Write a protein that binds this ligand. Sequence first.
Ligand code: SF4
Ligand code: SF4
Ligand code: FES
Ligand code: FES
Ligand SMILES: [Mg+2]
Ligand SMILES: [Zn+2]
Lengths: 690, 48, 125, 208, 115, 96, 109, 86
Amino acid sequence: SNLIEVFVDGQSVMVEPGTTVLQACEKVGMQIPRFCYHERLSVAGNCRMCLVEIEKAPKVVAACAMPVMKGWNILTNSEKSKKAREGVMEFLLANHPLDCPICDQGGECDLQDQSMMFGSDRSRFLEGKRAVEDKNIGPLVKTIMTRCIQCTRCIRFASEIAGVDDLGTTGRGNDMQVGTYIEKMFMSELSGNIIDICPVGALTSKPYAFTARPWETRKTESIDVMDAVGSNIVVSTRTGEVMRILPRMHEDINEEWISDKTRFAYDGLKRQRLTQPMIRNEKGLLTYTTWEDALSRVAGMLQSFQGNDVAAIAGGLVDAEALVALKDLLNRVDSDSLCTEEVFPTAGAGTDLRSNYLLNTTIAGVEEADVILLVGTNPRFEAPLFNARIRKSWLHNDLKVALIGSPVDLTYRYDHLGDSPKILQDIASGNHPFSQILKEAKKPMVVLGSSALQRSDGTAILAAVSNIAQNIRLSSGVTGDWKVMNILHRIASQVAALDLGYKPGVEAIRKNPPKVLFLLGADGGCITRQDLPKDCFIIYQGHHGDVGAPMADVILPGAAYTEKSATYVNTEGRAQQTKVAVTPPGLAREDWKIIRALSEIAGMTLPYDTLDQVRSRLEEVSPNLVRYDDVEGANYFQQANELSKLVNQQLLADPLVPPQLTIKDFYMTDSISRASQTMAKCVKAVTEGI
Amino acid sequence: PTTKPPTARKYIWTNHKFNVSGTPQQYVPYSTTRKKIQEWVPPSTPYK
Amino acid sequence: QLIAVDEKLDITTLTGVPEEHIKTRKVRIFVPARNNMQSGVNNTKKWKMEFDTRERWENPLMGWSSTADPLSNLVLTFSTKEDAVAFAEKNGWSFDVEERKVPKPKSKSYGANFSWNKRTRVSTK
Amino acid sequence: TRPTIRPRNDVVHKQLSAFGQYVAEILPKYVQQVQVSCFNELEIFIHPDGVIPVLTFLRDHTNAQFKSLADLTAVDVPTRQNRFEIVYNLLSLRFNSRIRVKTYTDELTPIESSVTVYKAANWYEREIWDMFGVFFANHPDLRRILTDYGFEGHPFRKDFPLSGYVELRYDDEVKRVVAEPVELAQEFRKFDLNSPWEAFPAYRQPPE
Amino acid sequence: GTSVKPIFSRDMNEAKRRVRELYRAWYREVPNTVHLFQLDISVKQGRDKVREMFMKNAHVTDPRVVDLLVIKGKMELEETINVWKQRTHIMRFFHETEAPRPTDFLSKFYVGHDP
Amino acid sequence: GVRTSPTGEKVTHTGQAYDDGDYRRVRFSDRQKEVNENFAIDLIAEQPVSEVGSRVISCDGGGGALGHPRVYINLDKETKTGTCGYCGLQFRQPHH
Amino acid sequence: GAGGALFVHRDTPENNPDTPFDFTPENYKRIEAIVKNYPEGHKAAAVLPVLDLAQRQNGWLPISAMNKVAEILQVPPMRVYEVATFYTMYNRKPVGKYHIQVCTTTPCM
Amino acid sequence: LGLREIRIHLCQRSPGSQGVRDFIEKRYVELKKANPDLPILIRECSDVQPKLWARYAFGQEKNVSLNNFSADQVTRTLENVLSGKA
Ligand code: SF4
Ligand code: SF4
Ligand code: FES
Ligand code: FES
Ligand SMILES: [Mg+2]
Ligand SMILES: [Zn+2]
């Protein structure tokens, strides 16, 4: 067709027009050495390490920028290419400091590896070296500027991916330097990624400094639970301890980036940890005890009370296995008061249709839209990688963005329609010009954040947004698989809980105050002892001492997300499973194992004994929870719209306000991050200039 | 050493010790690192 | 001379592995992710089989890292996922397979950095 | 290219190539492949059924005369359907040459014992059986040679763990040496050394 | 089909015959083993252990695997008869210094994290 | 910079001392606890800062090939001093 | 030899973001005239002249002048910092009333 | 003793779920109108088989195959479980 034939080392290949020499060499499986080229950043061409010889051409070309020409014959291993690489490595190493034993990049250095592979083995440089002063760009990214090779990757990432123009180059020639020119903190929810993309030890992790070397680390591929995006990560450990968190490439979800909370809150896993079962002594103080005693006390209280009296609240970091185990245990005592801390409207379709509470378009889809409307949510802090995808579409696909809410800074320009929820109705009726804008859009997308749903008028807000979606659908028809309707979540455990039949919100607890309460990692402070009768038996299960721990009668130490193989469902409805990096500390155990042992002690033994059996039970309840990369779903928007049209709950004259108003709020949100000293440093840095 | 004395440093031992094995001055190995996981401290006040 | 055996291959009783490390183990068959600290892709070419992580504790003397898991270090390299699956099946290990993830082809264009009316134009260089 | 690079020998390369062609022409029933390595070593890849004929020819032929078996061993490659690669190294004193013969097998398929052709193989085949679990048919006395009495499994196999499954200690209650499941005070620390950048372009594999 | 080459037996009947022969030989050897090694077990215990080791592999349906199992059992018998083995090797079958590891869910949950 | 814990045990340069309820202290009863008395952090804190009349200085730890790899230290910041990342020596330009 | 001038900025009581700088009304008329030459949507192209204009009114370029140019042209301040540190005719420190520049290149030497 | 929840698992594009799909296309809406407090969960399922699940008091469950059922058969089965029968 439009393919052209080119040759890499005399071997034919077909490439699309405009393909660079580097990509053509990659088609046959050859990797051209690089320092400044990154396939997710704009092409720079500055390093000059990618220079290659084209047959019958006297001048070497830059493979990362030059488009292949039909009939060209690249020669990646000719004498000219090798001498070019040797000369460029020589110029790169001329002023580089002899820092490898003290550099954190030591065994992970692209400069070191490409020096070993493509450069010479000697120096003929006999002059003094240049040295530059260090920059301070905050508490997360350590800066040692002498090591900089002037690739400019940090500048391109900050400008294009992060949306900030704080980094740059001052001066010129040999003295040219990368920095901010003023005392400025490069603070953003995606900042830590400049450590990954920097090929040298110029930009390093400050929390990670000096602790480990790459060859000793063990790599566990896992998933993040700090939000509802479900970013793929690698947990690096050494001798039973978590060293750091790295991104793992997933094209569909997080690409090769992760947010700063995903990257830097792991140290909170080492603080305020519940390690042994605890009970209240005669004086009403929490004291350590054995597993048997605590389980017997809980089982006694469970046997006495049945049905409505027994209740459970699930927190933000709970997995599907524990959720289904708790659901079965409370069902055996005829209880249906199984709730979450995050409210989703139960009116109409509610949880009956999955399509109703999921981001139907998906993260990948944003790249195929041209108009997006965001209602009552801050995409940047509730889902930083989702906001990164939105900015990528805004930059490369000219995506038009409009927002209804407080004018938060999203790092890209959008249309602020206001903050009054009544505007939604105005859009639904058709009196707003944005109604015409959505009417003519080929791939319109409407996104409603779950945070907006938390307020009392949320059922009304969802009805109005569904009305907007219905108007778009009836005017333009259905193009096929587009799924205009979307719900943006912020809690990792919410989608699986809804998939399991859990009732969203804590309303049923207030309606029917229970005598036995199961706090399963619930630290939101929603239900206190003022909302419960006296002599209420509160059981807390989790890994951190937070809001939910010091108000309990029995404390059961559970495992964090890094210490179990557990299932999480993201905003898209995709199901992923974590892997054990380290075992739980002290006497802590796996959460579903705690629930199963407690069921056995109380006489109503649960049918499952292993993890495969509990995942079979999970499949029995909701079969989509065992498909570990599938995101395909059926659209039931018409039924949900019909069911939503029934009630007509009134809106409020209250401006929509996101909980994460500013950057400081982004850091400490859950119990793991609240226990992190790095997040405390970040909060202190964004509140105090210094 | 009388005609070629060693270089003087202030951290070099001024008093040589012999093999002190099998003696209350013997070396006993131990871990030199600090505690890794800190446990939650329950509050000292009653909850009701 | 050929005898036409009809059954699935099974060598567990000959390997000498204790039954605990045959039935309660889960292997992972996967192509390892590229280390995000580097751009080389040479460590993402072959399939790997590795066992589930077991308990590690602290040695009372010296505080070293102690284990009781004999398979905590074993990593196997395979050309294709089918070979890894066949090995795990004939050795009697429960396995989880993950499809290979490749980076998608991206359309690069240097001239886009200087767009006349597009958003792609670079503010710096 | 002079001082630090190993010099070549094209005469020996030609002689070994011609002799490999000779061997392949004489025994087409078994010879599957013939190779001459860059440092002048000749290898002949055969079918297992031809272990005894080939070696016998290579020992008795007037133009061969490889009367000495220098070594015999196995290599474990788990990705191959036939796991084990059997390697015979032969030396000819009359012609001052060396040859390598390679064949393959799996866990359940015996190889013909070559004690009749070479007396030296006895302990080599016992060692291969002990370390890899490859049975040799018609062996005069096949049993473990290197491992402990009653030791289960084969240590040289890739799947077998480096420290094994059991350890030994003296127990005073039973007044004897006992075998127990291995526990390690310090776990062996696995290092990941492989560089993410390719070292040798000449060996690059097609991108599949 | 499946194109396999045998070791000794062509079907499960010959393999079972060889298994029975090896079982007879072990059964005859047990009293001599108890006498020579000065073991504190009874002959009944030794024959029970022989039966238990044979029944560990009762599920095998491949004649080649059975042939290899008989070869290994014959290797062990030859080893025992010639006294290559010591009393520690014979007693390793009984695991006399190994504390019983529980199999029910609750005890496993109490002791640690391993299933 | 030695100092004892409330239990009478010497605290090492690392800062590790067994806690009051830690049984492991029993390993020192009838024996001693090995503690090195020359704290490096204190000894390097006594060295005088070297004043040099150039923006960029070089350090190799002394002794030429017997020291550390040679590194170059920038001395443009006047609010602090340039510190060697190998030896810990400090350098500054003549200020005020 | 070496440049001598530093390419970082440290605040001083005489050069900080709160140092008073503002264009004269005549300079604002000149800024409007300068801006008009370039195509609409490409207003930044005026960074080079307008910055120079600031230096022609003040004598040098305090950090507040760079901030004012960045705010007037709606360009990120780091871009103006890049322009100011790249070009050698921009004075990021005060100079004398008369700036003597003697050529010492080879034909002139 | 009483109904607590219903679960319907239907394959997205298998022929044997086709009739069940029609049910959800037409007859699910009014069935939810009649039962505002009964949780009915519609979930996707593996190439295996379509199914319906009924939960009772104290966690008692049993399932009914809906393979090749037409929409009328589906709603008949649903009204049979919804009533005091079977
Ligand atoms: S960045 Fe690489 S080459 Fe430079 S000092 Fe660090 S390890 Fe060495
Ligand atoms: S700090 Fe790192 S990413 Fe930024 S320009 Fe220097 S080498 Fe490139
Ligand atoms: S990778 Fe092409 S010039 Fe840097
Ligand atoms: S003006 Fe002096 S060299 Fe040109
Ligand atoms: Mg870096
Ligand atoms: Zn030094």
